[PDB]
Amino acid sequence: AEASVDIQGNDQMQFNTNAITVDKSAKQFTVNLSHPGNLPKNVMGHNWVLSTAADMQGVVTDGMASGLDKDYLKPDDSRVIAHTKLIGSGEKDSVTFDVSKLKEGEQYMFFCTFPGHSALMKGTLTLK
Amino acid sequence: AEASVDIQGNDQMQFNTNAITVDKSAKQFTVNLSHPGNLPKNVMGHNWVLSTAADMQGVVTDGMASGLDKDYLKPDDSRVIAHTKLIGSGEKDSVTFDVSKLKEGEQYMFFCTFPGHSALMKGTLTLK
Amino acid sequence: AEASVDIQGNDQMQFNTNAITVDKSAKQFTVNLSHPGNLPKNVMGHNWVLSTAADMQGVVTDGMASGLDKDYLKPDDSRVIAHTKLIGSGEKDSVTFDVSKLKEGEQYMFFCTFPGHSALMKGTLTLK
Amino acid sequence: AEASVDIQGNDQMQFNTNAITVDKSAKQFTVNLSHPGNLPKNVMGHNWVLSTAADMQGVVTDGMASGLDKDYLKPDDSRVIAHTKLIGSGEKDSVTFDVSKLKEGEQYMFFCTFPGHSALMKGTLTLK
Ligand SMILES: [Cu+2]
Ligand SMILES: [Cu+2]
Ligand SMILES: [Cu+2]
Ligand SMILES: [Cu+2]
């Protein structure tokens, strides 16, 4: 809805989009994430994490180390621009963020930090 | 909102959905396929092919063996319940099939037959 | 090695190999599975499963529906030609099966049935 | 990579190896990429491209917007430490890099930039 988008993480380990362009005019941007399917959080949990394309591997990696308990994300990870919780099947979480925290000319990526998921579960937040 | 789905196949080789539910009640079923992106058909084509889950492997094998001149589908392959055209980026196609050609208690699956694709571009279809 | 093969399923969802060649003169064939890395089975579980290339999807679809508790393998699944248990990191398992269960010019796929992994974890098995 | 390392990208979109060990003593490294299979560059093209785990994504995203006519590689990408060209089956390319261009305690990776192959096709490389 102009300054929001709905993302679904599934039992097949996929997002439903790999591109999001956030609009200039928008003051804050929300991400509504849902997890259709039947698998719990501990085998197939998906979060939505945003960062510059250069900080991605560092966040996935520190996330990988942090554990299920840390939502598979390093607490107060300064490279994490915005993010939801790690939810299992049928659950939902949303994150709304300040747009002036993004700048034009920079490539961002969203990705899930559950182990190995970023493999297939990521996009460019097409602002790049 | 009921007996037709809109799906899309992208440039990162993913369908926007990996699972279609067909309410038995609907009598004809329609699928509108669009190719978001910029990659031409010879590079990243997307079709939407439906067979039983048992015939999928073979549709694919033979689909490959049929080159682009045949849209990566074997001519009048009896295994194909329905299918669209292989569409390059920025185009679309639609296909309507009779839902009576589906029997409860059987795994159906949609996949793209463009070489290499079936691995990510696929999902279930089920009468419900 | 002699009519037995060494393979891994690591933490990045990968097999080292994507093709096993079996000899018509090997009476039985043994596949030794080890999972290097630090992830526990619930997150990065790996089994090595064998079936024909046509039964792969149903074998995968059904095994996912089986649950961790059943190792993501539909028990008594007559479509499986051989399999290990699903192991976490630093665990091991091996399977030895009679080579007469294979027929010349039939195609064998080996894959992992852990939710999400088979698109990444699969390869070819062929009788020489 | 390695005195030389011989790698294969096939039509199943796979590299016959997910890990390189470049001997700190060997002064220039060679990687020989070949392509078993019968698929053309336009459909199943392969390049081996090396960078840091860190830059992996921006090169990937930037390689994709460059086209195969460019071999899906952004020219003068300072980040690519070395790369082959994109090749079709029945081809072999090679590349030799200066090994002082890598350091110890720096995460490196290889991947092919053909659209949607980076998720499958990738492995770490590490100075021994
Ligand atoms: Cu996930
Ligand atoms: Cu396709
Ligand atoms: Cu696995
Ligand atoms: Cu490739």
Curated annotation (Swiss-Prot), chains A, B, C, D:
Primary location: periplasm
Alphabetized GO MF terms: copper ion binding; electron transfer activity; identical protein binding; transition metal ion binding; zinc ion binding
Amino acids binding Cu cation: 46, 112, 117, 121
GO CC aspect terms: periplasmic space; plasma membrane
Pfam families documented for this protein: Copper-bind
Keyword Mitochondrion: no
Entries under SUPFAM superfamilies matching the protein: Cupredoxins (SSF49503)
Disulfide bonds, paired cysteine numbers: 3-26
Domain Plastocyanin-like: 1-128
PROSITE patterns: COPPER_BLUE
Keywords: Copper, Disulfide bond, Electron transport, Metal-binding, Periplasm, Signal, Transport
Keyword Transmembrane helix: no
Free-text function comment from the UniProt entry: Transfers electrons from cytochrome c551 to cytochrome oxidase.
Name this protein carries in UniProt: Azurin
Species: Pseudomonas aeruginosa (strain ATCC 15692 / DSM 22644 / CIP 104116 / JCM 14847 / LMG 12228 / 1C / PRS 101 / PAO1)
Organism classification: Bacteria, Pseudomonadati, Pseudomonadota, Gammaproteobacteria, Pseudomonadales
Gene (name only): azu
